[PDB]
Amino acid sequence: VVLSFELLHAPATVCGPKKSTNLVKNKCVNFNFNGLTGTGVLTESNKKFL
Amino acid sequence: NNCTFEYVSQGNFKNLREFVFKNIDGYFKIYSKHTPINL
Description:
The structure is cut from a larger assembly and holds two copies of chain A.
Chain A: no helix or strand
PDB class: viral protein/immune system
Keywords: SARS-CoV-2, monoclonal antibody, broad neutralization, m31A7, mono-GlcNAc-decorated S vaccine, memory B cells, viral protein, VIRAL PROTEIN-IMMUNE SYSTEM complex
Entry title: SARS-CoV-2 Spike in complex with Fab of m31A7
């Protein structure tokens, strides 16, 4: 079975997951939700979503 | 010839099927939104 690593001019749509996380307010840690990082408190906040 | 890619999932103006099509870097984005426009 062949796995071809072509990173050509066309966009890369082949990535992969690892591990697990569970972060709660009143603490202050990192985060990574499909790429975006940052350092701070992760509160299960009262905000909207769509 | 080739199938290089594929994918599978009153009448007074009940809705509208409008779609914008654009291309960047080759990758193509379909946009669909079936807005109900009874007017």
